[PDB]
Design a protein around this nucleic acid. Structure first.
Ligand SMILES: Nc1ncnc2c1ncn2[C@@H]1O[C@H](CN(CCO)CC[C@H]([NH3+])C(=O)[O-])[C@@H](O)[C@H]1O
Ligand SMILES: [Mg+2]
Length: 91
RNA sequence: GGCAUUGUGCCUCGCAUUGCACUCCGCGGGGCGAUAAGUCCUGAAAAGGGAUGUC
């Protein structure tokens, strides 16, 4: 808060992992270089995603711009990740 | 290829689920080594790939 990583939820759980990942990437890539998307369809982690930006400017612009955007017929809910993703905590 | 066991992850249907991960598996049916994926394995890596037993 802020953070390199944004946590998206209220996502449409019927989307296949591999295309949700590439969809998040194609859309959020417009707000800066991206290092990873982490997506699981587990019961704990379905409906959600972590997209990890290289620079925090990117993240906060993505969080402000894309808040509530209609994505696969649901409005995205975007917060800052509560904590640093492991790949940005190694640097 | 068949069979047993099994690591690993994918798809789909019903019910359920708004859930802060990188220490990762909802329940119940159905379909999977596949040029997906993988948290499992091989390699010193970049890359690659189920495994052990048994006809
Ligand atoms: N990565 C793969 N790619 C293609 N197929 C796979 C793959 N992993 C597994 N299977 C399939 O699962 C079957 C074996 N079951 C047990 C029954 O024997 C394991 C189920 C699962 N591990 C579980 O614990 O719920 C194999 O024959 C494959 O068809
Ligand atoms: Mg099932």
């Amino acid at each position: 808060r802020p953070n390199h990583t944004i946590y998206i939820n209220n996502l449409n759980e019927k989307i296949k992992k591999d295309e949700l990942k590439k969809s998040l990437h194609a859309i959020f890539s417009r707000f800066g270089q991206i290092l990873d998307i982490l997506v699981k369809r587990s019961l704990k982690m379905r409906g959600q995603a972590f997209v990890i930006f290289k620079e925090v400017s990117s993240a906060t612009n993505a969080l402000r711009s894309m808040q509530g955007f209609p994505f696969y017929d649901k409005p995205m809910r975007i917060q800052y990740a509560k904590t640093d993703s492991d790949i940005i905590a190694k640097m």
